[PDB]
Amino acid sequence: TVTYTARVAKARFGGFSKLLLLWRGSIYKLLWRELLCFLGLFMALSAAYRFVLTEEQKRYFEKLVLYCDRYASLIPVSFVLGFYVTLVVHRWWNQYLSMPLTDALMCVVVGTVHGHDERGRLYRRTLMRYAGLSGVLILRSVSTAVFKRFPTIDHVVEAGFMTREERKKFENLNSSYNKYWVPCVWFCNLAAQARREGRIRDNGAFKLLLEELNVFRSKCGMLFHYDWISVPLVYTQVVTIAVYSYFLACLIGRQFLDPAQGYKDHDLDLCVPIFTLLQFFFYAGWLKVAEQLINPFGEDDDDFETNFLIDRCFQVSMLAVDEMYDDLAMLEKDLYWDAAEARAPYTAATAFLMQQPSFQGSTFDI
Amino acid sequence: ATSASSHLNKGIKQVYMALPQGDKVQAMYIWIDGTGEGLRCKTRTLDSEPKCIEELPEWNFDGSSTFQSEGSNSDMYLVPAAMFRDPFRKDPNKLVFCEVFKYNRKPAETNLRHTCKRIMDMVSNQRPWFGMEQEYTLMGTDGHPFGWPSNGFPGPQGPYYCGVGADKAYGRDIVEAHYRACLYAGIKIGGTNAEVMPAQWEFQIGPCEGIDMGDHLWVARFILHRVCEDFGVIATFDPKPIPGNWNGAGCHTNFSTKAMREENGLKYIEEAIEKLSKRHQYHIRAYDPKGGLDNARRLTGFHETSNINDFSAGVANRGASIRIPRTVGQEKKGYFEDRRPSANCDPFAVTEALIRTCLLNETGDEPFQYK
Ligand SMILES: [Ca+2]
Ligand SMILES: [Cl-]
Ligand SMILES: [Mn+2]
Ligand SMILES: [Mn+2]
Numbered sequence: 001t002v003t004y005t006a007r008v009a010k011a012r013f014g015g016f017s018k019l020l021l022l023w024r025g026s027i028y029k030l031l032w033r034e035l036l037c038f039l040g041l042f043m044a045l046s047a048a049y050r051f052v053l054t055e056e057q058k059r060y061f062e063k064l065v066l067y068c069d070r071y072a073s074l075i076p077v078s079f080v081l082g083f084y085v086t087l088v089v090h091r092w093w094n095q096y097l098s099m100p101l102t103d104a105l106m107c108v109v110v111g112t113v114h115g116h117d118e119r120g121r122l123y124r125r126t127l128m129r130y131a132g133l134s135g136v137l138i139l140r141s142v143s144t145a146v147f148k149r150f151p152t153i154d155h156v157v158e159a160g161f162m163t164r165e166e167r168k169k170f171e172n173l174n175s176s177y178n179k180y181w182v183p184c185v186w187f188c189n190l191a192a193q194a195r196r197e198g199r200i201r202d203n204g205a206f207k208l209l210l211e212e213l214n215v216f217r218s219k220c221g222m223l224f225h226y227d228w229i230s231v232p233l234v235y236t237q238v239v240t241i242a243v244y245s246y247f248l249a250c251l252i253g254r255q256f257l258d259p260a261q262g263y264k265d266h267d268l269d270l271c272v273p274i275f276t277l278l279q280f281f282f283y284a285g286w287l288k289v290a291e292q293l294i295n296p297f298g299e300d301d302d303d304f305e306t307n308f309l310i311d312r313c314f315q316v317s318m319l320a321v322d323e324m325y326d327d328l329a330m331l332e333k334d335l336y337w338d339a340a341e342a343r344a345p346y347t348a349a350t351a352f353l354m355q356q357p358s359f360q361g362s363t364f365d366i
Numbered sequence: 367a368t369s370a371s372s373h374l375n376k377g378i379k380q381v382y383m384a385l386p387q388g389d390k391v392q393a394m395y396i397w398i399d400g401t402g403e404g405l406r407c408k409t410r411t412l413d414s415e416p417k418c419i420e421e422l423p424e425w426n427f428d429g430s431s432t433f434q435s436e437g438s439n440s441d442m443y444l445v446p447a448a449m450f451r452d453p454f455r456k457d458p459n460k461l462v463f464c465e466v467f468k469y470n471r472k473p474a475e476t477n478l479r480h481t482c483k484r485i486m487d488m489v490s491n492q493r494p495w496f497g498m499e500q501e502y503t504l505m506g507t508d509g510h511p512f513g514w515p516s517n518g519f520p521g522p523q524g525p526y527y528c529g530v531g532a533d534k535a536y537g538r539d540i541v542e543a544h545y546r547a548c549l550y551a552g553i554k555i556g557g558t559n560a561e562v563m564p565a566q567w568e569f570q571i572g573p574c575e576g577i578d579m580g581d582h583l584w585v586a587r588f589i590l591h592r593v594c595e596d597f598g599v600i601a602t603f604d605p606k607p608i609p610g611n612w613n614g615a616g617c618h619t620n621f622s623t624k625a626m627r628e629e630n631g632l633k634y635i636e637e638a639i640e641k642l643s644k645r646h647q648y649h650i651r652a653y654d655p656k657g658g659l660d661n662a663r664r665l666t667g668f669h670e671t672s673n674i675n676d677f678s679a680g681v682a683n684r685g686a687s688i689r690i691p692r693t694v695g696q697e698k699k700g701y702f703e704d705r706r707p708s709a710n711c712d713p714f715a716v717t718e719a720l721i722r723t724c725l726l727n728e729t730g731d732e733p734f735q736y737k
Contacts, residue, residue: 119389196458198386 001025002302025301027285030292038280041251042273049255062257062266069253074279077242081286084239088231092293096304098222100135102128102313106320108212112205113194116326123194124321127209130183130190131216132314133161137180138220142227143297143306161314178224184217231294243287250276367506372598383455391415392459394452395425395444396588397466400433402476402655403603403710405588415458422446422462429468434476439469447479448581453547454592461551463585478714479580481733485718486576488737489725493624495701496579496717497556497572501615501709502590503607504537504565505600511565511608512537512599523613526564536565537599544586544593545569553586554578562670563613572620580713583617603710605654605664614664614671615709621720622701631699632690638724639679639688639702645723646677646687648731652719653707661708672705 002025008015023029049061106128113124136156139146149155153170156162162170162183170182188210195206230236254276256269292300336342346354391412399406408427416422429435429442444464452459466474473480486494504512513536514520529535541558548555548569556570569590571583587603594601606614625634642649650658658674665674672678672687679688681695687706694700707716722728726737 197388 001305027281027288029301030288031281031284034284035277035280038247038251039277042255042276045251046256046271050258058258059261061255062261062263065252065255065257066263066266067253068249072246072249072253074246074283077246077283080239080242081283084231084235085286085290087235088290088293091226091231092296095223095226095296098219098226099304099306099309100131100138100216100220100223100313101309102131102135102216102317104212105131105216106317108205108209110321110325112200112209113321114199114201114326120199121322121325123190123199124325125318127187127190127194128317128321129161130187131213132310132317133166134180134183134187134217134220135313136161136310137178137183138223139297139306139310141178141180142223143304144299145297146306146310149307180220180224181217184213184220187213227297236290236294239287239290243283246283247280250279367508368598369507369595370598371595376596387459389414392452392455393422393462394455394460395446395462395464396585397427397432397444397464398476398584398712400429400474400476402478402712405584405591406432407588416449416460419446419449419462422449422460425464429466429474434466434474435468441469442474443467443469443471448578448585450551450553450585453550453589454596461585461588463581463588476712478712478718479577482580482714482718483577485721485726489623489721490576491624492725493575494717494721494725495573495575495620495622495627496713496720497570497574497620497701498579498583498707498713498716499568499570499616499618500583500586500603501561501566501568501617502601502603503563503615504540504567504594505602505607507598507600511563513565520564523562523564523611526560526566527562529560529564534564535560537567537597540590540594540597540599540601541567541569543596544590547589547593548586551585551589553589554582555586561613561615563608566607566613566615576717579717583713603708605660605708605710609663611669613669616664616671616705617707617709617711617713617716619704619707619716619720620701621704621724623725626701627699629699632695635690635694635700635702639690641723641727642688642704642720643677643679645729649704649706649719649723650674652715653711655710655712660710661706664708665706 002022004019004022007019020026049058053061109124109127113127114120115123133156136146136150136159140150140156141147150159153162153167157164157167166186170179173179173182191200191206191209191213194200195203200206200209254273256271256273257263257266259267259269292302296304297306391414392409393412393416394407394409396405396407398404406427410425412422424446425444426441427444428440430437430440432442434440434442443466445467446462447465448463450461450463451457452461465479466477468474506512510517520526525534538560541560545555545558554572554574556572558567558569560566561568569586571586572579574582587601590601603615605616621638622631623634623638625631626638650661654661662674665671667673667676667685670684672685676687678686679690680686681690682692683689684705687704689703689705691700691703694702704716704720718733722733726734728734
């Protein structure tokens with residue numbers, strides 16, 4: 001992922017303009033090869049027209065240039081691009097929201113699975129490790145970077161996510177389908193065992209744990225669904241054909257004709273179609289947005305950082321359920337115990353922007 | 367008079383039993399001692415709930431303390447045979463009924479299940495079904511029946527059979543607790559009634575297939591003893607607890623095969639009974655833990671019993687050795703009831719004798735070897 005929200009915190013004079021100077025995850029890094037290809041074909045065709053072609057053939061070539069320029073439609077391709085890219089962006093954001101995150105699970109576990117002893121600590125750590133393991137399994141199924149990090153289940157075992165005995169139980173299961181759901185079933189069994197053993201004190205807490213487990217598992221299933229069910233291939237081919245047809249039309253129809261013929265709208269030759277190159281940037285980059293977001297778990301610069309999320313979730317969940325279990329500072333009175341109003345101070349840098357009348361409603365200025 | 371243990375505050379025990387026990391599981395190992403009629407038990411802690419009987423470890427005990435061995439090699443071995451849920455400790459704790467083996471892994475003298483299982487496996491295709499009506503008498507710790515006047519007798523028999531009211535049924539609390547405890551444990555208990563003798567009761571076990579009859583009845587007996595121990599009274603299976611015009615306790619055994627249950631199965635019922643007609647003495651010896659002396663006090667032919675010395679069979683004959691139920695006669699199929707076995711009989715001995723005589727066509731005064 002390429003984060004630039006710090007740069008665009010305000011609508012400045014040169015806000016979006018300086019974003020064109022970035023390289024990592026930029027339009028240039030995605031297009032420059034197609035840009036050089038389009039420029040190469042355009043320059044080769046222009047050179048052939050200027051030198052190689054006969055005078056007789058040049059009249060036919062320029063008539064074909066006029067014909068190809070008449071059918072260069074830039075408006076209709078904008079519709080198919082807008083709709084297709086909007087669908088791809090919707091899928092991309094929903095895919096990000098489906099990342100297996102264990103924050104809800106860690107909060108429930110640390111608040112419901114009890115015991116300062118070795119067994120309670122084993123319960124909490126193993127409950128969160130099961131969710132981490134199912135996250136790792138689904139992500140290595142869907143993400144190329146995680147797969148290269150965990151090429152085999154042996155890599156998962158050496159990483160500490162799954163144990164030797166859990167590995168034997170995992171491989172002995174007779175199923176031809178992806179087994180990312182297995183640690184979730186293990187989580188359900190372990191939660192039921194903890195409730196039976198009294199580690200979970202109340203019936204509500206067990207229900208809350210299974211509700212939060214099914215939310216986590218549904219996110220894993222949703223990542224599998226997005227991975228399996230692509231954007232329909234026919235629609236992707238339609239947008240690609242529209243864009244490539246328009247650019248093939250622009251390659252010939254926008255060729256610089258000899259001004260000596262005096263054809264209208266073609267009485268100039270700048271030997272570089274800079275406005276056609278700007279249109280190429282526009283439409284080719286608009287397609288490149290979808291081409292980068294269509295599978296957001298690849299190795300694009302703007303693709304999701306799945307390995308970082310795995311590491312963060314594992315470390316934070318272990319910290320929260322093990323070192324932070326029932327480890328609280330003693331209850332004491334805050335700065336505003338005796339104060340009628342509870343208001344924090346402002347720094348010298350924020351006071352002169354703040355201290356303004358508080359909004360009470362639209363109807364109170366009558 | 368109830369025992370000193372029954373006078374300890376039950377409230378207190380409950381408070382301890384309400385504690386969550388955690389990850390450890392209790393297994394109570396139950397076995398038959400050297401009298402062939404007494405049950406012994408002890409408990410071990412397991413790391414986890416066993417999923418089946420196969421997960422339970424073998425255990426051991428001192429046979430010299432159970433009338434089962436003497437001298438140096440008195441260590442005996444317990445091999446789990448049937449598992450049940452523990453009604454005294456609740457899930458996930460278990461009752462483990464075990465076979466007993468000597469130090470050299472030979473079956474113990476009161477281990478009748480070892481041979482009984484082999485016989486049942488031989489006739490497995492015929493699918494023998496059993497049912498036993500276990501009669502028992504509740505007694506105070508003084509050896510007098512529960513509820514009876516001190517050193518005296520209640521009114522004559524007549525109102526007590528299936529009776530209700532404080533003057534008709536004695537110790538129904540024990541009967542209700544036992545019935546529930548058996549249902550919770552997974553015992554195939556079919557019903558209960560108050561018997562003709564006051565403080566005498568009965569529970570039905572079955573239908574059970576093959577070796578399951580002995581396991582279910584023995585564990586049902588154990589639960590009754592353990593339930594009676596809680597109330598501070600004694601359950602006796604003595605075939606004649608009180609001399610005179612007071613009913614004996616029997617264990618009436620119902621028997622049927624796949625052939626007898628099928629349409630026109632009465633012909634196979636009659637064939638089995640005429641085979642039983644020729645082996646009355648062999649069955650009387652097997653139907654009692656001490657060779658038929660206890661059942662001599664019960665089988666007098668007077669109180670709805672038959673004569674121990676004479677065999678008789680008939681349809682709807684309460685006084686016969688073997689009874690064909692009236693409905694079974696009408697439907698021409700079903701089961702027949704052997705009314706000979708004593709209340710303190712070993713079900714492994716009873717079921718094995720019925721299969722040997724009726725299904726394996728065994729004859730003579732000794733059981734066949736290897737068949
Ligand atoms: Ca991508
Ligand atoms: Cl014990
Ligand atoms: Mn009866
Ligand atoms: Mn009967």
